Amino acid sequence: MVQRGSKVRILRKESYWYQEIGTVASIDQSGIKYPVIVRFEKVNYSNVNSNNFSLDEVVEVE
Amino acid sequence: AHTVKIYDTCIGCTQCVRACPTDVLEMVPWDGCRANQIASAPRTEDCVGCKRCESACPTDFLSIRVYLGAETTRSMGLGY
Amino acid sequence: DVAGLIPCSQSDAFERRLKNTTQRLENRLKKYEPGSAPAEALQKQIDKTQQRFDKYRNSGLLCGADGLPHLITDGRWSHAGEFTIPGLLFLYIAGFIGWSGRSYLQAVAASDNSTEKEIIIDIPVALQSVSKGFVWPLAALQEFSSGKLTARDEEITISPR
Amino acid sequence: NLPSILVPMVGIVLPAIVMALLFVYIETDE
Amino acid sequence: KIVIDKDPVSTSFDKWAVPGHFSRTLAKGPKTTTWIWNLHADVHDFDSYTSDLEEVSRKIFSAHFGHLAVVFIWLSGAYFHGARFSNYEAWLSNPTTIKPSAQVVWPIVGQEILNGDVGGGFQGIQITSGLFQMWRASGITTELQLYVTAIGALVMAALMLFAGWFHYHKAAPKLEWFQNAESMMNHHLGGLFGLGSLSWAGHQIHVSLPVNKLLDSGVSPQEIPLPHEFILNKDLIAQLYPSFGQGLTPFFTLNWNEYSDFLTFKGGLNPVTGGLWLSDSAHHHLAIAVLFIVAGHMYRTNWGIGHSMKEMYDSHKGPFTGEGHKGVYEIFTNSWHAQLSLNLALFGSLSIIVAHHMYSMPPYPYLATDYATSLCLFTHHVWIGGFLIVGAGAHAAIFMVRDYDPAQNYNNLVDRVLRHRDAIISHLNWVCIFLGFHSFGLYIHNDTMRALGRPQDMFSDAAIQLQPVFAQWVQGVNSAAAGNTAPNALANASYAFGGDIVSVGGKVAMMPISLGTADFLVHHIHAFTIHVTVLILLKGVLFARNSRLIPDKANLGFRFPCDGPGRGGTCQVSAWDHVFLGLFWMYNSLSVVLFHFSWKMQSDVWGNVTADGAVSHITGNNFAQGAITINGWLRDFLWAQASQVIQSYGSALSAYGLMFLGAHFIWAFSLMFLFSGRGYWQELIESIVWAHNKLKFAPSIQPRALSITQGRAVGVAHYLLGGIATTWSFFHARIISVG
Amino acid sequence: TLNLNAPTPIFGGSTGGLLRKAEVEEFYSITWTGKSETVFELPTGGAAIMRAGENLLRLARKEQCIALGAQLKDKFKITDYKIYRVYPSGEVQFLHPKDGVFPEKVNPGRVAVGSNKRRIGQNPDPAKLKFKGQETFDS
Amino acid sequence: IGHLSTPISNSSAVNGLLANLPAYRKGLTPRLRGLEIGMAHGYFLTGPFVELGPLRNTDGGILYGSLSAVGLVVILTACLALYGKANFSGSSKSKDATLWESGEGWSDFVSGWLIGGAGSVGFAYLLLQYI
Amino acid sequence: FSKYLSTAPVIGTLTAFFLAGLLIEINRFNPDLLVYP
Ligand code: CLA
Ligand code: CLA
Ligand code: CLA
Ligand SMILES: CC1=C(C/C=C(\C)CCC[C@H](C)CCC[C@H](C)CCCC(C)C)C(=O)c2ccccc2C1=O
Ligand code: SF4
Ligand code: SF4
């Protein structure tokens, strides 16, 4: 279980920020798949900084 | 025709639909939640393959993909 | 004498390059007025030539059949000043500029706006990294031993497999 | 003498034949 | 009506800190490294971020002051280096023998070998800019007059730079001060062009003509009185052309015939120098002034009399063309790009007209015998002119994307050209293919005929003749025109059409450039290469908004790389990419014009004259039978005349040899950007960010590959720089040695 | 339906439109009501004038209809554009709005065509689908 | 309206020349209109071959030049046969039903181009070497 | 203006102006340094 503000590492192998550190901005309090919103320092090639991940793709390195 | 497949990491952002220049895409309600949406491509025969729907998807490594298949007269974008 | 290369003090092809370089400048001098300003600039050019042939004769260089000084990199210590000595002189200077820009970026990245400080360069943090950059052959030794010079592969981003 | 017959045969005539069967084989249809 | 604003912009350094301050897209910080190139791309494009035409035009006005500053700064350096570091004083005593020179090179690592034996008691770089011949025609005899002019340009540079600060920060004019085109046309015609040619006509009479009358009598540059003495001492201006003793009473009483000795119509070349007669050019700009001052009283202002350009276009409409020119005035007083493209078209079209009128009618004394300068003066202004014509097709395309309004343009002359553009482009498409076959294929025919041992079947002068009869006739009506249809002129408009050989020194100043079978071929190569260059640029203009392929190409922009790999692939569809492709074709077109020029003159025109009168040219009349085949263009021109740019190592021409190979590098380096694409490098950089992220020092400004539009731009920039600077080095090292 | 005949805009021009492809198979027509007599750019060349109308325009491509149908929604705010594709020498009537509403708006009763119940990193290798009729993205 | 209306578009001075050429003329059968087309093009095609040839000042040049021009017509008979083999497959009908739209006569048109093409090449050989 | 001189193009130029002029003045008093003597 990840909470907001927690510094996570992404295990989604397709992501631009795979195996990189980001801070969770929020989690969605419903049963929606991919609820974990992580904000990253580094922008991807579409110059965005957020994505929706699941709890299986993140860890709790804090 | 080019194949357009929409993956489940979509968020109902509606951005790829309004960036389509040939009116391929549309928004549809979702089954398991009945509140959020997803894009859908019921008119893939109209698809020219411009990949403007991939330039508008906000998810990291976009939820809608375009695979350039066989080239008909519509997908070649020919006025003749 | 390592590859049939005679030294340049007894190499006659090298001593004949000097005879033709000054003869191509004395005939360039022979037409001008002797007290003029282009006349003295050719004698400054003639004597600058004589200061490179006498600099290469006494340095013990190796001239071939053409008469040009060849360099020998296998590094021998009798020919150490060709590549080994300015190469060591190179490697400290390049590693100084290398470790300075690396120490600058690690200091800047743990701040509020890191990308801002790459455009406008913080002269405090820039001159700090010069102070941390002069000690780099010592500073990288305890940096590599501490485990914080490199990163493990679970921390870097990597293309999908 | 055989060069004078053979080189305008495969230089001109024989390409014009194989261009004809190919162009019919391309633009035919089932 | 002058209307301004008082202090709209403060004079602060708060925005000097932040780069990218002007736009909402920038100044947030570079998250990637494209921002470093996004900043330098859209700075001087004021129209994008600022959405007020009043604010846009104030930026544009005060910026030309800054460009006026850098020209004056550059002009002072032309005058300073002629004052200090030149042999201009020794050159006036012997202008044929002594090579013109400035730019002494410092005694460092060996580049003081470039300070060569250039003439007299001076050592420097033999320059090819013609400033020595321009200052002699201006009358300058000592270096003090060059030194004060270098100071005079720097105070003028500060005057323009202060005026750009003043007219944006302090007193910026409103929009209505800029939209007054009739008062602007009135002022620039009579004032800038008329008084500028009236006041220069004053210099050529009082200053240039007296000192040149004694210089072509050949006394000394020291014995000649200073040019203020020709204003003060009226007895001194009476011993040479004694019509100054009557004053301005021939002028006001219309008895202008008394000025028949310093306002002539002699019209030839000076037999002592090989330049135009200065009394012709004195009479010239005086006649140009009155035509320009009178024409500046044409357009209407706040005094009622005068033409209105809005009502000349209304009721200039035919039955073919619908509503006529109705709307082109309102387009031209609102679009800054349509004003830019048209003023760029005829600035670059003029710059090639300047090149053609200056080798054949050499305006300056000892410019014609200076083959080292007359070729570089031609090849410069041709090259300057072709860049500006590409900027015409560029800025006409930027007009179409955001300044074109369909509501203002219904059935006018912009609408009706955008409605039959498929008829314009395809008929332009055919005429390139017709000209490419029937001009280049006549070289391919002549290669194949001379290779097969069939020299009687090619197109030559001893073969199937293609004589240029429409140009040889025009050579006849202009060579026999002095005395019959221009009866007051003593000699022809030029010696290029027909006339004697003017021989100044031992060398040809000018001689009749004949036309033959080879000249038919190259002039149709020129007709072909221009028509493709038009075809790429005009396709970009007419299809800048839409096509059958992309119907919303103006919604995507003037400068975007592609609409994707669909519709078969839509790479280089935008209006910017046609400007990018036309740059090579402009490079392709102009480089043949300069290859045509450099060998036409060396074989048929330029050369030496013996003591009897026979001419021996430079390359020896080998343009007639060599320049009809591509092998003769390779063997007798590019291989045979680059024998001075490669045998130049170890001599004073060595920096031409180093610029030769060094520009082959930058040309070939450009193909790395042109042939390849971006997404290779963006995954190659992903291996180099890793090897920097491994040692924990990867930059926070994330490294990106150059964009698709930038990678095209950085590849065309090094392409032109690589080939022009090769042609720069080949031309300079050749004609300095032989001419 | 297409309501042909409907008045063409007052145009008279455009080499660049509706050539021989239209008479054999598949041309398109966009129909709208323009609430002025104002000028608008065509995808062919630029002007016509929109009628009071019932305005109709026969275009060559569907891509040219949505480009014009975007201009009427942008510049004139007339979003009532209703494109078609013709009969016997054409294919399919009533192309847009396909379900009585714009595709960016949600409408129940639509079915998610081309949806995938997986991500893109969960796509199989092509070696697993080698020598089969399956493709590496279809489900 | 989709087509542009210039003042010289639909002019009767050139719409009468189009309606009377043997490609649009109403009274002709495909054997006759192939002959009229073939007689015109074969007549001028021997023009450039006899005056611009590899051999022009020979015995010799009028025959071999005209031998080259019938060489083009026998090539272009194949092109008119191959265009009819390809574009009229099954004699593909269309909306107009002319010689150019559906096939319907096409084997006679190529022979008509063959007869008139080889005729006027040889007919102009008479007026050049003789007459 | 001092915060302007800390920006990348100017401080990329004046240090390159410094490092070039370092190398330029070296070759004037110490010409033709092939090897270490
Ligand atoms: C590779 C094979 C090939 C061969 C063997 C030839 C042979 C020839 N060509 Mg070349 N040509 C070729 C390919 C070839 N061509 C290609 C690929 C090009 C494009 C680069 C050319 C471009 C070219 C030009 C522009 C010309 C030639 C000409 C010639 C003729 C020069 C000698 C001559 O005049 O005899 C004298 C003989 C004659 C003048 C008449 C020959 C008999 C004619 C061609 C056929 C008679 C018709 C016959 C009933 C049926 C058709 C048979 C035919 C298709 C073989 C010779 C027949 C010249 C020529 O005369 O063209 C006809 C000429 O002007 N060629
Ligand atoms: C000297 C005092 C001074 C000061 C403090 C300012 C300050 C300002 N000016 Mg002003 N202005 C001035 C004089 C001054 N200006 C002059 C002399 C001119 C006439 C050129 C102008 C014309 C002008 C315009 C049109 C605009 C400004 C603007 C500005 C504001 C932002 C500019 C900026 O931050 O970029 C600083 C820019 C630089 C440091 C680059 C200067 C480039 C110079 C002029 C030419 C360099 C080319 C050179 C020849 C190099 C060639 C290549 C090389 C390799 C050889 C800032 C308040 C902008 C504004 O107010 O936006 C709302 C704006 O649009 N100024
Ligand atoms: C030298 C290399 C080269 C060549 C040959 C061409 C040729 C052409 N370019 Mg290209 N182009 C080039 C470099 C070249 N370009 C480069 C580097 C760029 C990137 C900037 C471009 C970008 C470009 C643009 C943007 C455009 C062109 C266009 C054209 C065409 C102009 C039409 C014409 O006159 O054809 C005449 C044909 C020739 C001159 C070729 C000579 C061949 C001889 C005469 C005939 C061949 C002999 C024989 C019959 C061969 C057949 C026998 C065989 C089959 C057995 C022509 C095909 C334009 C176009 O297509 O518009 C119509 C156009 O708009 N090109
Ligand atoms: C080589 C190449 C690249 C890679 C080139 C890049 C990334 C440019 C980077 C090179 C410059 C020189 C980096 C400059 C870095 C610093 C500014 C250096 C500062 C040094 C100071 C001392 C001045 C592309 O991105 C590309 C894209 C599209 C088509 C072709 C190509 C292409 O050919
Ligand atoms: S484009 Fe992709 S991310 Fe955006 S709404 Fe459509 S499916 Fe979701
Ligand atoms: S490729 Fe283009 S046309 Fe096809 S769905 Fe995506 S945006 Fe629409």
**Distance (Å) from CA E523 to ligand 3 centroid:** 18
F119·A13 Cβ contact <8 A: no
Name chain A's partners: 3 or more CB pairs within 8 A: B, C, E, F
* CA nearest neighbour of E409 among F45, F68, F37: F45
| H/E run at residue E116 | strand E116-119
Nearest alpha-carbon partner for F15 in F76, F78, F60, F80: F60
For residue F84, the cross-strand partners are: F29
Q: Which two tokens stand for residue E622?
A: 């080998």
Which residues span the domain enclosing B42?
A: 1-80
Question: Tokens for E587?
Answer: 């490079």
Domain encompassing residue G57: 12-129
B51, B60, B61, B63: best to mutate for the A interface, most A CBs within 10 A: B60
User: In chain D, what are the helix, strand and coil shares in percent, each to the nearest 5?
Assistant: 85, 0, 15
* E411/F contact by beta carbon, under 8 A: yes
Rounded Cα distance, E349 and E339, in Å: 15
CB A59 within 8 A of CB C155: no
Give how far F12 is from chain G: nearest CA, Å.
Answer: 5
Number of structural domains found in chain B: 1
How far apart are alpha carbons E512 and E532 in whole angstroms? 31
DSSP 8-state symbol, H7: B
> Phi then psi for G19, rounded to 5 degrees?
-75, -5
Mutate to test the interface with A, among F119, F122, F125, F137 (most CBs of A within 10 A): F119
If one counts the domains in chain C, the total is 1
Q: How far is CA E130 from CA E127, E342, E369, E395, in A?
A: 8, 30, 12, 33
Q: Of chain E residues 553-612, which have a CB less than 8 A from chain B?
A: 563-568, 570
Task: Give the residue ranges of DSSP H helices in E360-440.
Answer: 371-398, 421-435
CA F21, F23, F27, F29: dihedral to nearest 10 degrees? 140
How far apart are alpha carbons F137 and B6 in whole angstroms?
A: 10
Show residues of chain B in contact with F118, CB under 8 Å. Answer: 7-8
Q: Which residue has the tokens 């002119």?
A: E385
Q: Is the peptide bond before B21 cis (omega within 30 degrees of 0)?
A: no
In this structure, which ligand is nearest to the CA of B15?
5
Angstrom distance (rounded) from CA E271 to CA C9:
61
Strands B37-40 and B26-29, bridge-based pairing: antiparallel
* Residues of chain H immediately before an interruption (C to N > 2.5 Å): none
Which residue range forms the structural domain that includes residue C104?
1-161
Is E94 an 8 Å CB contact of chain A? no
Q: Is E440 in the pocket of ligand 3 (CB under 6 A)?
A: yes
Partner-chain contact E419 F70, CB within 8 Å:
no
Which residue, B52, B11, A30, is CA-closest to E555? B52
Chain B, 10 to 39: residues with Cβ < 8 Å from chain F are: 14, 17-18, 20-23, 25-31, 37-38
From first CA to last CA, the distance across chain C in angstroms is 56
- Could you tell me if residue G4 is inside a domain? no
Is B7 in contact with B44 (CB distance < 8 Å)? Answer: no
Q: Which of B18, B27, B43, B51 to mutate to test the pocket of ligand 6 (most atoms within 8 A of CB)?
A: B51
End-to-end CA distance of chain D, in Å? Answer: 46
Is E415's Cβ below 8 Å from some Cβ in F? yes
Cα Rg of chain A, angstroms: 11
Whole-number Å distance between alpha carbons of B8 and B15: 15
E705 and E678 Cβ atoms separated by less than 8 Å:
yes
Task: Determine the atom of ligand 4 nearest the C-alpha atom of H12.
Answer: 23
Residues with CB under 6 A from ligand 6: B 4, 19-22, 24-25, 47-53, 66; E 566
Residue E542 CA to ligand 3 centre (angstroms): 22
E33: which residues sit within 8 A by CB, 6+ positions away?
A: E701, E702, E703, E704
Q: Which structural technique was applied? A: cryo-EM
What residue owns the CA closest to ligand 1's atom 62?
A: G68
Concatenating the DSSP letter of every residue in E141-195 gives -SHHHHHHHHHHHHHHHHHHHHHHHIIIIIEEE-HHHHS-HHHHHHHIIIIIIIH
- Detail the residues of B annotated as belonging to a binding site: 10, 13, 16, 20, 47, 50, 53, 57
| Chain E neighbors of H1, CB-CB under 8 A | 13, 16
Ligand nearest to the CA of E70: 2
- Is some CB atom of chain B closer than 8 A to the CB atom of E548? yes
DSSP code, position E512: -
Q: Tell me the β-bridge partners of A9.
A: A21
Structural domain count of chain G: 1
Omega before residue E229 within 30° of 0, cis: no
Q: Name the region of E169 (left: φ>0; alpha: ψ -120 to 50; beta: rest).
A: alpha
Cβ under 8 Å to A: C residues 96-155: 153-155
User: Token pair 């010239």 is at which residue?
Assistant: E284
C-alpha–C-alpha distance, residues E531 and E428, integer Å: 7
Q: DSSP string spanning G53-93?
A: SS--SSS-HHHHHHHHHHHHHHHHHHHHHHHHHHHSSS---
Could you tell me the two tokens for C109?
């990245």
Q: Is any ligand 5 atom within 6 A of the Cβ of residue B25?
A: no
Q: Whose CA is nearest to atom 27 of ligand 3?
A: E532
| Cβ of G54 less than 6 Å from ligand 1 | yes
Ligand with smallest separation from the Cα of B40:
5
Question: For E650, how many CA atoms within 13 A lie in the half-sphere containing its CB?
Answer: 6
Reported in sequence order, the residue ranges of chain C that DSSP labels E, i.e. its strands, are 6-7, 62-63, 69-70
Contacts of E319 in chain G (CB under 8 A): 7
- In angstroms, what is the C-alpha Rg of chain D? 13
